[PDB]
Scaffold this active site. Structure first.
Site, PDB file in Angstrom:
ATOM      1  N   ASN A  45      65.564  61.565  44.856  1.00  0.00           N
ATOM      2  CA  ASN A  45      65.671  62.293  43.598  1.00  0.00           C
ATOM      3  C   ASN A  45      65.818  61.351  42.411  1.00  0.00           C
ATOM      4  O   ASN A  45      65.325  61.658  41.320  1.00  0.00           O
ATOM      5  CB  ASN A  45      66.850  63.263  43.649  1.00  0.00           C
ATOM      6  CG  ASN A  45      66.520  64.555  44.375  1.00  0.00           C
ATOM      7  OD1 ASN A  45      65.357  64.878  44.606  1.00  0.00           O
ATOM      8  ND2 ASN A  45      67.552  65.302  44.738  1.00  0.00           N
ATOM      9  N   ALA A  70      76.285  75.972  57.244  1.00  0.00           N
ATOM     10  CA  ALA A  70      76.719  74.760  57.931  1.00  0.00           C
ATOM     11  C   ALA A  70      77.773  73.993  57.146  1.00  0.00           C
ATOM     12  O   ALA A  70      78.521  73.211  57.738  1.00  0.00           O
ATOM     13  CB  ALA A  70      75.515  73.859  58.206  1.00  0.00           C
ATOM     14  N   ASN A 129      60.148  69.623  42.706  1.00  0.00           N
ATOM     15  CA  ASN A 129      59.449  70.406  43.716  1.00  0.00           C
ATOM     16  C   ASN A 129      57.960  70.473  43.418  1.00  0.00           C
ATOM     17  O   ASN A 129      57.137  70.434  44.337  1.00  0.00           O
ATOM     18  CB  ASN A 129      60.048  71.807  43.794  1.00  0.00           C
ATOM     19  CG  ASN A 129      61.532  71.785  44.074  1.00  0.00           C
ATOM     20  OD1 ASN A 129      62.059  70.816  44.616  1.00  0.00           O
ATOM     21  ND2 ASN A 129      62.221  72.846  43.683  1.00  0.00           N
ATOM     22  N   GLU A 165      77.651  63.102  52.553  1.00  0.00           N
ATOM     23  CA  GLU A 165      76.222  62.854  52.734  1.00  0.00           C
ATOM     24  C   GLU A 165      75.933  61.805  53.801  1.00  0.00           C
ATOM     25  O   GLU A 165      75.037  62.038  54.632  1.00  0.00           O
ATOM     26  CB  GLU A 165      75.589  62.442  51.399  1.00  0.00           C
ATOM     27  CG  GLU A 165      74.759  63.519  50.738  1.00  0.00           C
ATOM     28  CD  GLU A 165      74.098  63.038  49.461  1.00  0.00           C
ATOM     29  OE1 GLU A 165      74.557  62.024  48.897  1.00  0.00           O
ATOM     30  OE2 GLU A 165      73.118  63.675  49.021  1.00  0.00           O
ATOM     31  N   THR A 222      75.369  64.418  45.636  1.00  0.00           N
ATOM     32  CA  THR A 222      75.877  65.765  45.398  1.00  0.00           C
ATOM     33  C   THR A 222      76.814  66.232  46.506  1.00  0.00           C
ATOM     34  O   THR A 222      77.030  67.437  46.661  1.00  0.00           O
ATOM     35  CB  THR A 222      74.717  66.749  45.251  1.00  0.00           C
ATOM     36  OG1 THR A 222      73.953  66.770  46.461  1.00  0.00           O
ATOM     37  CG2 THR A 222      73.818  66.351  44.093  1.00  0.00           C
ATOM     38  N   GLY A 242      74.093  70.299  55.629  1.00  0.00           N
ATOM     39  CA  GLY A 242      74.458  70.745  56.956  1.00  0.00           C
ATOM     40  C   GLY A 242      73.309  71.408  57.685  1.00  0.00           C
ATOM     41  O   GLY A 242      72.965  71.013  58.803  1.00  0.00           O
ATOM     42  N   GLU A 254      43.877  61.130  61.990  1.00  0.00           N
ATOM     43  CA  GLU A 254      43.505  59.830  61.438  1.00  0.00           C
ATOM     44  C   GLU A 254      44.685  59.196  60.717  1.00  0.00           C
ATOM     45  O   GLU A 254      44.862  57.971  60.752  1.00  0.00           O
ATOM     46  CB  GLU A 254      42.322  59.989  60.486  1.00  0.00           C
ATOM     47  CG  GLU A 254      41.034  60.383  61.174  1.00  0.00           C
ATOM     48  CD  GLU A 254      39.865  60.490  60.221  1.00  0.00           C
ATOM     49  OE1 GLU A 254      39.599  59.514  59.489  1.00  0.00           O
ATOM     50  OE2 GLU A 254      39.206  61.550  60.207  1.00  0.00           O
ATOM     51  N   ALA A 280      66.845  73.038  49.811  1.00  0.00           N
ATOM     52  CA  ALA A 280      65.790  72.145  49.350  1.00  0.00           C
ATOM     53  C   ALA A 280      64.453  72.524  49.966  1.00  0.00           C
ATOM     54  O   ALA A 280      63.425  72.548  49.277  1.00  0.00           O
ATOM     55  CB  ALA A 280      66.139  70.699  49.692  1.00  0.00           C
TER      56      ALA A 280
HETATM   57  N1  LIG Z   1      64.325  67.490  45.210  1.00  0.00           N
HETATM   58  C1  LIG Z   1      65.161  68.493  45.457  1.00  0.00           C
HETATM   59  N2  LIG Z   1      66.303  68.268  46.196  1.00  0.00           N
HETATM   60  C2  LIG Z   1      67.161  69.282  46.458  1.00  0.00           C
HETATM   61  C3  LIG Z   1      66.897  70.556  45.983  1.00  0.00           C
HETATM   62  N3  LIG Z   1      67.900  71.364  46.381  1.00  0.00           N
HETATM   63  C4  LIG Z   1      68.789  70.637  47.093  1.00  0.00           C
HETATM   64  N4  LIG Z   1      68.348  69.344  47.143  1.00  0.00           N
HETATM   65  C5  LIG Z   1      69.020  68.234  47.836  1.00  0.00           C
HETATM   66  O1  LIG Z   1      69.778  68.743  48.916  1.00  0.00           O
HETATM   67  C6  LIG Z   1      71.043  68.122  48.984  1.00  0.00           C
HETATM   68  C7  LIG Z   1      72.102  69.117  49.441  1.00  0.00           C
HETATM   69  O2  LIG Z   1      71.828  69.565  50.748  1.00  0.00           O
HETATM   70  P1  LIG Z   1      71.104  70.977  51.000  1.00  0.00           P
HETATM   71  O3  LIG Z   1      69.714  70.774  51.542  1.00  0.00           O
HETATM   72  O4  LIG Z   1      71.079  71.782  49.728  1.00  0.00           O
HETATM   73  O5  LIG Z   1      72.004  71.716  52.106  1.00  0.00           O
HETATM   74  P2  LIG Z   1      71.615  73.218  52.509  1.00  0.00           P
HETATM   75  O6  LIG Z   1      70.142  73.293  52.808  1.00  0.00           O
HETATM   76  O7  LIG Z   1      71.996  74.159  51.393  1.00  0.00           O
HETATM   77  O8  LIG Z   1      72.474  73.546  53.825  1.00  0.00           O
HETATM   78  P3  LIG Z   1      74.063  73.752  53.703  1.00  0.00           P
HETATM   79  O9  LIG Z   1      74.726  72.423  53.444  1.00  0.00           O
HETATM   80  O10 LIG Z   1      74.599  74.348  54.980  1.00  0.00           O
HETATM   81  O11 LIG Z   1      74.337  74.688  52.554  1.00  0.00           O
HETATM   82  C8  LIG Z   1      71.332  67.591  47.594  1.00  0.00           C
HETATM   83  O12 LIG Z   1      71.911  66.307  47.648  1.00  0.00           O
HETATM   84  C9  LIG Z   1      69.994  67.543  46.889  1.00  0.00           C
HETATM   85  O13 LIG Z   1      69.652  66.205  46.588  1.00  0.00           O
HETATM   86  C10 LIG Z   1      65.750  70.790  45.240  1.00  0.00           C
HETATM   87  O14 LIG Z   1      65.509  71.916  44.816  1.00  0.00           O
HETATM   88  N5  LIG Z   1      64.882  69.754  44.980  1.00  0.00           N
END
Ligand SMILES: Nc1nc2c(ncn2[C@@H]2O[C@H](COP(=O)(O)OP(=O)(O)OP(=O)(O)O)[C@@H](O)[C@H]2O)c(=O)[nH]1
Ligand SMILES: CC(=O)O[C@H]1C(=O)[C@@]2(C)[C@H]([C@H](OC(=O)c3ccccc3)[C@]3(O)C[C@H](OC(=O)[C@H](O)[C@@H](NC(=O)c4ccccc4)c4ccccc4)C(C)=C1C3(C)C)[C@]1(OC(C)=O)CO[C@@H]1C[C@@H]2O
Ligand SMILES: Nc1ncnc2c1ncn2[C@@H]1O[C@H](COP(=O)(O)OP(=O)(O)NP(=O)(O)O)[C@@H](O)[C@H]1O
Ligand SMILES: Nc1nc2c(ncn2[C@@H]2O[C@H](COP(=O)(O)OP(=O)(O)O)[C@@H](O)[C@H]2O)c(=O)[nH]1
Ligand SMILES: [Mg+2]
Ligand SMILES: [Mg+2]
Lengths: 386, 451, 432, 113
Positions: free
Chosen positions: B206, B99, B228, B183, B179, B144, B254, B12
């Protein structure tokens, strides 16, 4: 308790002897008479004060007041008030070159010492004499001057900076970073007094060779403790003894000031003018609400217009017992000025303080409730319900 | 030189960084290869703004970015993409596993042996910077990496730099949509770091952004690119005050001086008013009053929470484009008369205002219409408590039976880092409940002396 | 030869000073590059009040520019009159206060105050006979309020005998642009009441009201506010520069307007103001200026004078006019509004007349009032202050930089004492 | 500045033969016209003594005035105008305004008249 008022007349000096030496001040009992030299036909205006003192002639016995006489009459009384647990103050007033340094400080090398040395010596004698197994005493000293709306410390070594005046929400104004020195014996506080008198700012003028240039405040914090392992409370009493020596008002024509000596004088006069207003203001208020009905709607006292009146907010009125010593000049030429002092002195007795003084408000509440319980229990026992 | 270092962690974070850096490159006229032909055409200028880009000798501009992840895939997509020449080759990507939706795996086991390199490169970037304002950390709760490694990195940064501000943009789990099955655990375990170390944390959802896209932009099938891009617009609106001139400029200090009454309540919501399609851009005036009112509509919030159920504690409006102070003053005045919007009685002012001249840009291939005016609102309120409470409930429903716990304890943790976190959440919710209560009636009980 | 050193602090002060230097520069006839291209011989007679003389027949204004964020300084340099100021007087740092009075007064400004005082001393040493200073800043902001108060304290420490003027923009009831305005305003007012001879009150609400109602403008910006304020500053000190039938130095205004030392918060106003549409209808004469000056809606402080009493007022006219008409009109204003003036100051209206009007006008007038209604403004701030201090809304930011609750308490007490000192004289019927 | 003024007056008197007196023009209310007049009259009385000294002064008007602190300045000149001046003539702005309005038919007189 109303403000205590003392007045004192001094002898002739060189300036009076060289010029016309006609006296105008007379004294009888508690009554002080002033006579206008320009109008002998007019009434001999007179004022009744709590105390009046004649120091014109020493051999004679016409109500002659040595330093010890005024000390007994005012300072010993106010010290006894202090031992009972009351914040206490004595402050001087009048005009330039009259009596303040002589009355409050005096000549150390001579026997004719001022009020401050004699009060300190008697206090030390009393704490040393009355010491006991349970009773105990502690004392602390400080000494500050107001030069030109700036506070400086004398007992401390050379500190070129100027201290900052601050306001505790409950205890009112104070001076931050003031060297409060612990002392244990009369000789040590005497040494502190000598150093402080040396450190003051003094300059020579026509009216007086040693004309003071700055107001001075001498504070003694006294603590009285009673020790008991069962019921009694330690630190039973805390008192503040404040002796104030104010620089007198000046006139540029007679003073002969020029340059810095003039500017200093201007500040002094300002610091006096505001003070006069405060006194007048205070008097009317404590005369009005007391006598008029009791309305207590709203009355503003201009405490903040000068640092002198600001620091002495609790002394001129409120939580202290205060005495005012006025210095007079017997010279005929001084009449139009001298009478002015008397007028404010005539108003000074009208002022009324509000002093109770306690400590440890938790202990205050506990003592109040315990006394109420004891009173109610005694009432029940007396009436057969206990 | 109002320099800011951006850090992107997780998938993300990296994708939001892609959107953000596309917008930044378009804003200052930087080509994908780092060259700026605008200065060559003109002759010279300050267009290479040092907030984001550092200029080398040969006219190239390297962004002040730090991308981090444990999967090679997400950043190998960037190394061979359109912007491969823009970034420095060093991208801090551990050629190992990930992770795996495991906080313990990202914080204790695998987070090590990659933190040192990341801190070294952050130090190298910080040495080049004069008057560094702060950090902008992008990550996502529930993952993770974005939980564990973000926690570790924030801890180390707080140890080292300390006094520099550290803003946070994070994707909170939605109430219904999700997802991953684990979580709540990863989300709850990050509270200690998002509280003790960060200075201001902005949360987005989201579900809320999907609702906004479906209702306003008329996109029935959005993907993460649109989300994004919206988040990139938000961050650009936040950061524009220290890149372009304006009537009233609001620095990053500020922000914190005005928005956070107490250290532990630094969780403001965010929103963007003129989110509208090109077709609907017509038939509308898009005046200051309209966008300012739309900022307060509950439907337009970026987190699934109703402000009407809480009280507004502080508000910060940041306007862009053809705006004047008197319209903003009128908008605030008419807002203060609405009874549906309640402010805490101990913040009678309740508004901070900033204005910038540069209007928002349009990304080709985007879906937001070109507009003359825009406003971004950041609002610290008490409704955010609800967003925690639901998630808290979910956590309990899994921790009563110790489900999925052996994976976490098998990597370095014990069960107590699983309760301590829950107690911290409870304390935070109690604080948010306590701050929003009205002052007790005549808070000196009652008064009145003689006269 | 009387002359003034000028200091500017913060964004608001910097912008108002820039506009002010554009206005004064016209009257005296000064090219943006620095050369003189006037027509009247009396423009250069007393130009040394504001401008030092350079070698090449140029004139450099005696201004000091202070800030902690560099950006505003750039906006001054990249402007119509950016090159007029000498570069050595641009004193600035980095990492601005961020609307935190503690940073401006204690932490950040304590380092730049030395350099600012160095430049001020350098300017003041060359002065033939330094009269006094004047500072433009905003009380409700960050670096402006804090550094202004600190510089005022230092200058009064070093130059006790000189006049210390101040033009302050304070908060408003409805117009608010920062969440923590009450704290900054309270501490600033606590600092100003001690260390200042004159303080003119300016409010954005009053200026917007004047623009909408009097000048009938539709889209006013800060340029118009700066225009009005700069017109007032030029009006205050006209008599040092140009001859007049009856002059009025700054000290004359200070003496005649201040009855007691702590009551020196003035309400300014200017006339005429005609909106560019009604200019052909009204006749311009002394009665019209008198009527417009004392009108409630013309004041710049957003405090209705009808809610109190006028302790003192001063009227500085510019133009060729008869003294008899001026005296008669002032007496009529006193007599008709008998209930809005105090009963123990007979003839509490200072009058001044200067023979040279502004360049585009036949007549003009400036009004400087001193009335009890100003208490309302302070009361408002005090109210808001309590509403945040009782719960300690944002106190950790201020206490983290080296302050404590005691400074807040003493500032609030001082403000309340000033508010009580005005009311005293406010009510009629001094007896009971 | 008083010393320079007395030096110039001394030079003029030395030039003069059979000097008759001094015509002093000043104004009450103003700081200079009051204080410096007092200084100058004191020094002139000390120096010359027997020469006549006539004042032409503008006394404050009952109703209209151009300052708030006029009464203090005017009252503090009593000693000077009583002891040192030999004959002082007083004029009022209001009276001359009325004379101009009624006799000369000037509706808007200024200080020149
Ligand atoms: N808004 C938005 N949310 C995202 C996006 N990609 C992933 N997410 C959020 O990230 C969550 C999943 O966790 P990630 O941040 O993808 O985990 P990771 O960074 O891949 O790290 P690992 O779990 O080790 O693979 C999902 O529930 C999504 O809601 C994105 O491109 N845009
Ligand atoms: C009479 C005429 O034909 O034009 C006037 C005019 O119409 C009026 C409306 C002018 C006009 O003022 C405004 O429109 C205005 C707008 C916003 C804020 C303030 C003013 C004028 O712009 C303002 C301008 O003022 C001046 O020129 C003064 O000298 C003024 N200096 C400046 O404005 C100035 C600005 C930038 C650079 C140089 C000078 C001044 C005022 C006080 C003290 C010193 C100088 C003047 C006379 C006029 C116009 C041009 C229409 C007025 O303003 C002043 C201060 O004179 C509005 O109230 C007056 C009444 C005038 O009649
Ligand atoms: N009652 C008195 N008996 C004897 N000597 C006195 C008496 N009063 C004053 N003197 C002396 O006369 C002089 C003037 O008194 P002094 O106390 O110095 O004036 P002052 O009070 O200090 N005025 P100031 O200090 O300017 O406020 C000193 O030398 C005193 O010792
Ligand atoms: N009259 C006027 N007021 C201004 C201007 N700019 C800002 N202000 C006021 O100043 C306040 C903000 O203070 P600020 O200038 O940021 O203080 P600083 O941060 O210390 O420089 C706001 O409440 C505005 O009302 C201006 O150009 N003109
Ligand atoms: Mg003495
Ligand atoms: Mg991943």
């Amino acid at each position: 308790a109303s403000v205590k008022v003392a007045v004192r007349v001094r002898p002739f000096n060189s300036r009076e002897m060289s010029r016309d030496s006609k006296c105008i001040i007379q004294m009888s009992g508690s009554t002080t008479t002033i006579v206008n030299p320009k109008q002998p036909k007019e009434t001999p205006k007179s004022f009744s004060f709590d105390y009046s003192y004649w120091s014109h002639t020493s051999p004679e016995d016409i109500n002659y007041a040595s330093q010890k006489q005024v000390y007994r009459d005012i300072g010993e009384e106010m010290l006894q008030h202090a031992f009972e647990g009351y914040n206490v103050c004595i402050f001087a007033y009048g005009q330039t070159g009259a009596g303040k340094s002589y009355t409050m400080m005096g000549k150390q090398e001579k026997d004719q010492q001022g009020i401050i040395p004699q009060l300190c010596e008697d206090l030390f004698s009393r704490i040393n004499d009355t010491t006991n197994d349970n009773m105990s005493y502690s004392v602390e000293v400080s000494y500050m001057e107001i030069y030109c709306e700036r506070v400086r410390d004398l007992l401390n070594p050379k500190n070129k900076g100027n201290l900052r005046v601050r306001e505790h929400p409950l205890l009112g104004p104070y001076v931050e970073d003031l060297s409060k020195l612990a002392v244990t014996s009369y000789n040590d506080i005497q040494d502190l007094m000598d150093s402080g008198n040396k450190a003051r700012t003094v300059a020579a003028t026509n009216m007086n060779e040693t004309s003071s240039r700055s107001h001075a405040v001498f504070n003694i914090i006294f603590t009285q403790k009673r020790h008991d392992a069962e019921t009694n409370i330690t630190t039973e009493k805390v008192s503040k003894i404040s002796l104030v020596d104010l620089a007198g008002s000046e006139r540029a024509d007679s003073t002969g000031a020029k340059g810095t000596r003039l500017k200093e004088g201007a500040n002094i006069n300002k610091s006096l003018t505001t003070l006069g207003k405060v006194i007048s203001a205070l008097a009317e208020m404590d005369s009005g609400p007391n006598k008029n009905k009791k309305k207590k709607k709203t009355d503003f006292i201009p405490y903040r217009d000068s640092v002198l009146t600001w620091l002495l907010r609790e002394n001129l009125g409120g939580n202290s017992r205060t005495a005012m010593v006025a210095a007079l000049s017997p010279a005929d030429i001084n009449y139009d000025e001298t009478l002015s002092t008397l007028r404010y002195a005539d108003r000074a007795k009208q002022i009324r303080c509000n002093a109770v003084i306690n400590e440890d408000p938790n202990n205050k509440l506990i003592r109040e409730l315990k006394d109420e319980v004891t009173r109610l229990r005694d009432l029940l026992y007396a009436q057969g319900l206990g | 030189m109002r320099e800011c270092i951006s850090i992107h962690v997780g998938q993300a974070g990296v994708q939001i960084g892609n959107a953000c850096w596309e917008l930044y490159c378009l804003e200052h006229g930087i080509q994908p290869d780092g060259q700026m032909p605008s200065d060559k055409t003109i002759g010279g200028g300050d267009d290479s703004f040092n907030t984001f880009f550092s200029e080398t000798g040969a006219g190239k501009h390297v962004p002040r970015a730090v991308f981090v992840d444990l999967e090679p895939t997400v950043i190998d997509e960037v190394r061979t993409g359109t912007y491969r020449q823009l970034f420095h080759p060093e991208q801090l990507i551990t050629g190992k596993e990930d992770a795996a939706n495991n906080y313990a795996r990202g914080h204790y086991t695998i987070g090590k042996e990659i933190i040192d390199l990341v801190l070294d490169r952050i130090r190298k970037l910080a040495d080049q910077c004069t008057g560094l304002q702060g950090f902008l950390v992008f990550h996502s709760f529930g993952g993770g990496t974005g939980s564990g490694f973000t926690s570790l990195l924030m801890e180390r940064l707080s140890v080292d730099y300390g006094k520099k501000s550290k803003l946070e943009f994070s994707i909170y789990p939605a109430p219904q949509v999700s997802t991953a099955v684990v979580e709540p655990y990863n989300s709850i375990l990050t509270t200690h770091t998002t509280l003790e170390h960060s200075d201001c944390a902005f949360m987005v959802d989201n579900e809320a952004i999907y609702d906004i896209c479906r209702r306003n932009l008329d996109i029935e099938r959005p993907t993460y690119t649109n989300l994004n891009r919206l988040i990139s617009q938000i961050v650009s609106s936040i950061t524009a005050s220290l890149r372009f001139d304006g009537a009233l400029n609001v620095d990053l200090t500020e922000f914190q001086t005005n928005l956070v009454p107490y250290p532990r309540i630094h969780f403001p919501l965010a929103t963007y008013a003129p989110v509208i399609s090109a077709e609907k851009a017509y038939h509308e005036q898009l005046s200051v009053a309209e966008i300012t009112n739309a900022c307060f509509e509950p439907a337009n919030q970026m987190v699934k929470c109703d402000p009407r159920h809480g009280k507004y504690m502080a508000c910060c409006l940041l306007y862009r484009g053809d705006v004047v102070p008197k319209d903003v003053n009128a908008a605030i005045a008419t807002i203060k008369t609405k009874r549906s919007i309640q402010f805490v009685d101990w913040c009678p002012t309740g508004f901070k205002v900033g204005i910038n001249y540069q209007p928002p840009t349009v990304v080709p291939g985007g879906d937001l219409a070109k507009v003359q005016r825009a406003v971004c609102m950041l609002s610290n309120t008490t409704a955010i408590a609800e967003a925690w409470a639901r998630l808290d409930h979910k956590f309990d429903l899994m921790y009563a039976k110790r489900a999925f716990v052996h994976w976490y304890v098998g990597e370095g943790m014990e069960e107590g880092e699983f309760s301590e976190a829950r107690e911290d959440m409870a304390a935070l919710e109690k604080d948010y409940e306590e701050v929003g209560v009205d002052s007790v009636e005549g808070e000196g009980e009652e008064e009145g002396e003689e006269y | 030869m009387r002359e003034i050193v000028h200091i500017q602090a913060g964004q608001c002060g910097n912008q108002i000073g820039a506009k002010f230097w554009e206005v004064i520069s016209d009257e005296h006839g000064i090219d943006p590059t620095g050369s003189y291209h006037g027509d009247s011989d009396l423009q250069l007679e007393r130009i040394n009040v504001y401008y030092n003389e350079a070698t090449g027949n140029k004139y450099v204004p005696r201004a000091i520019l202070v800030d902690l964020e560099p950006g505003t300084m750039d906006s001054v340099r990249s402007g119509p009159f950016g090159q007029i100021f000498r570069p050595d007087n641009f004193v600035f740092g980095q990492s601005g206060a961020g609307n935190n009075w503690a940073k401006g007064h204690y932490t950040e400004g304590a380092e730049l105050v030395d350099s600012v005082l160095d430049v001020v001393r350098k300017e003041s040493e060359s002065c033939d006979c330094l009269q006094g200073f004047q500072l433009t800043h905003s009380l409700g902001g960050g670096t402006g309020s804090g550094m202004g108060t600190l510089l005022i304290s230092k200058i009064r420490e070093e130059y006790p005998d000189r006049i210390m003027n101040t033009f302050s923009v304070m908060p408003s009831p409805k117009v608010s642009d920062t969440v923590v305005e009450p704290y900054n305003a309270t501490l600033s007012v606590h600092q100003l009441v001690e260390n200042t001879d004159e303080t003119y009150c300016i409010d954005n609400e009053a200026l917007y009201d004047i623009c909408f109602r009097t000048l009938k403008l539709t889209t006013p910006t800060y340029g118009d506010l700066n225009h009005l304020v700069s017109a007032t500053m030029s009006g205050v000190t006209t008599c040092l520069r140009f001859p007049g039938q009856l002059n009025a130095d700054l000290r004359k205004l200070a003496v005649n307007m201040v009855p007691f030392p702590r009551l020196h918060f003035f309400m300014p106003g200017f006339a005429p103001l005609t909106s560019r549409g009604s200019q052909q209808y009204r006749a311009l004469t002394v009665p019209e200026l008198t009527q417009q000056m004392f009108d409630s809606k013309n004041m710049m402080a957003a405090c209705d004078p009808r809610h109190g009493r006028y302790l003192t007022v001063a009227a500085i006219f510019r133009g060729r006019m008869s003294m008899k008409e001026v005296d008669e009109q002032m007496l009529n204003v006193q007599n008709k509004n008998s209930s809005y003036f105090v009963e123990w100051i007979p003839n509490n209206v200072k009058t001044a007349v200067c023979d040279i009007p502004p360049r585009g006008l036949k007549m003009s007038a400036t009004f400087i009032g001193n009335s009890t209604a100003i208490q309302e403004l302070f009361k408002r701030i005090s109210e808001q202050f309590t509403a945040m201090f009782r719960r300690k809304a944002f106190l950790h930011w201020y206490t983290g930089e080296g302050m404590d609750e005691m400074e807040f308490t003493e500032a609030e007490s001082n403000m309340n004492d000033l508010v009580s000192e005005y009311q005293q004289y406010q009510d009629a019927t001094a007896d009971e």
